[PDB]
Write an enzyme that holds these catalytic residues in place. Structure first.
Site, PDB file in Angstrom:
ATOM      1  CD  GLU A   1      -3.130  -1.342   1.787  1.00 49.28           C
ATOM      2  OE1 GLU A   1      -3.283  -0.612   2.802  1.00 49.28           O
ATOM      3  OE2 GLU A   1      -3.674  -2.469   1.615  1.00 49.28           O
TER       4      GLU A   1
ATOM      5  CG  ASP B   1     -13.349  -6.404   2.739  1.00 45.33           C
ATOM      6  OD1 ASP B   1     -12.372  -5.626   2.955  1.00 45.33           O
ATOM      7  OD2 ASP B   1     -13.931  -7.101   3.621  1.00 45.33           O
TER       8      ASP B   1
END
Lengths: 247, 244
Positions: free
Chosen positions: A18, A205
């Site tokens: 990330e 998600d």
């Protein structure tokens, strides 16, 4: 006194994947001496964009298992070491996380966090309960919310990636839009050492949503992380030249 | 070479004070670990040994002991870096399993330690969440002091959820606390030997609300932990780590 423009910022990013798109975007360089401490797996990236010195720190590879050292404990350690070593004006916790559709989150949204709690420090007695929950406010950034128009929400933290019914009960009761594994521990450390903390939470998600199609999670991480880097870029540019009060 | 420096990591003031008084340690006034934190540090010397006891202090917002994994892990790291001790001792009260042979009053050594509330259903992340670490091996201490021994399971809650129990049972824990595994995690990062003294205040399988028992036993069981910590300190004096 006397107050002045922000000069340096640290990002606390748990997953080294990330962080990489932010490192490239800014021409940050992996430090080869060891500021935070000798013989640690922690990774630090340093650079200067314009009027901003930029630090990005990652807890790095676990020795036993060969993965990123996720969870509240490595995140709190690196928040503490990088604050004392690096003396940032502001901390930004950026990372991907879960989201609740019933709370309005959508895959690939990058949220600015309003405040943070824990869902897994349950101490069911007077005054230890509140301490366990650990409600902390993110530093207030009305102008940056106006420019960027990012969605906003409470974040709820625990060291479990799944969600038990016990977690869910408390995440519901506390009105969290987001669920991660670090943020509230970063918020704890930042508070102890009195440094303003911001959160950029990218939703990968939907805790309460359908499982992704074939092509979906194939693309999903790459697409959501690009969305996160893009928002982190705009935060940095916005911050540049501004006082904390102008944020 | 002989062990010269030991640091106690103790989560609660009430657990710490008995040992503070027993060794006539003095409260550190200069905030060596950082300006402006609630952390508490008592310092002294016993015979050959430098002694330090570090606690996470009173929560600035709420005014109670800053318990759980994050405070523990912070003070363990900061005190290792400041003081460079030879060995760390995590001392405190905990819950025990009666069917596992724990009884109220018992001060256990700890063989190894796991987490019960870090569940990551990804290969290799699962084992990382659990965080199985071996306590530093002290066979002679165990022998001479005649201490009970068992595995310790750590998590940030005082109660026990269903999936908490599931992992505690699967990991065959005798003991349940809120710091140990985190202390071990840090001692491992920094390669410092860690040992644990865990004094049973309440029986997790038993016939009582945890916190009612916990608090009913605390004053007396913390005298008991001082008793063992004292003896442990006397044993360590003049010895190598391999002598332990």
């Amino acid at each position: 006194e006397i107050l002045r423009p922000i000069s340096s910022v640290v990002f606390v990013i748990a997953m080294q994947a990330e962080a990489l798109p932010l490192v490239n975007k800014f021409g940050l360089s992996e430090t080869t001496d060891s500021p935070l401490g000798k013989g640690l797996p922690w990774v630090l990236y340093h650079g200067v964009h314009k009027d901003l010195r930029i630090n990005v720190v990652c807890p790095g590879r676990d020795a036993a298992l060969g993965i990123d050292s996720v969870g509240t404990v490595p995140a709190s350690l690196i928040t503490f070491a990088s604050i004392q070593a690096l003396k940032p004006d502001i901390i930004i916790n950026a990372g991907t996380c879960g989201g609740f559709k019933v709370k309005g989150a959508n895959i690939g949204d990058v949220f600015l966090v309003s405040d943070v709690v824990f869902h897994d420090r349950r101490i069911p007695i007077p005054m230890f309960d509140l301490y366990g929950v650990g409600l902390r406010q993110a530093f207030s950034t009305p102008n940056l919310l106006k420019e960027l128009n990012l969605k906003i929400g409470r974040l709820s933290t625990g060291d479990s990636l799944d969600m038990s019914t016990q977690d869910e009960t408390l995440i519901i009761a506390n009105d969290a839009t987001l669920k991660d594994m670090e943020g509230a521990a970063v918020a704890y450390v930042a508070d102890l050492l009195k440094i303003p903390v911001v959160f950029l939470k990218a939703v990968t998600d939907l805790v309460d949503g359908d499982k992704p199609t074939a092509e979906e999670f194939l693309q999903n991480l790459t697409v959501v992380t690009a969305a996160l880097e893009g928002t982190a870029t705009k935060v940095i540019n916005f911050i540049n030249g501004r006082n904390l009060s102008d944020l």
